[PDB]
Ligand binder design. Structure first.
Ligand SMILES: Brc1ccnc2ncccc12
Ligand SMILES: [Cl-]
Length: 130
């Protein structure tokens, strides 16, 4: 209907605002762009599911997120990818891992404080019923 359209627009607006708040945080500057294949020519071979905040924005705007659950799966990728590609004890790796998973914990904490559970449930029930 347009009730349903109104629901998904509100979701998109909410997901944009969360994604913007992550993207202007200095800690996360490295996650605002896909990994450059110049700097890292083995990344896009090793990391099957590249994910970054600019990609998340594109998916919001292409209506690929019908639930916060779907959105958080992509946020989880930004962290799990960082852990997978940068596992070493050296500070370079430890810093990207720390940041990647602080991005994850920030997104979860924002959504925990600001997402109405009943709004997520409505989104889930519309999605399941399609
Ligand atoms: Br730059 C860079 C190098 C290594 N791993 C990375 N993981 C995620 C984002 C950027 C990365
Ligand atoms: Cl830096």
């Amino acid at each position: 209907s347009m009730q349903e359209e109104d629901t998904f627009r509100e979701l998109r607006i909410f997901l944009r605002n969360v994604t913007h708040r992550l993207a202007i945080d200095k800690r996360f500057r490295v996650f605002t762009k896909p990994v450059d294949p110049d700097e890292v020519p083995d990344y896009v071979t090793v990391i099957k599911q590249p994910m970054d905040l600019s990609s998340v924005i594109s998916k919001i705007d292409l209506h690929k997120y019908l639930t916060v659950k779907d959105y958080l799966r992509d946020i989880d990728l930004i962290c799990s990818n960082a852990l997978e590609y940068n596992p070493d004890r050296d500070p370079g790796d430890r810093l990207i891992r720390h940041r990647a998973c602080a991005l994850r914990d920030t997104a979860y904490a924002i959504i925990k404080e600001e997402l109405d559970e009943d709004f997520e449930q409505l989104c889930e029930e519309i999605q399941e019923s399609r």
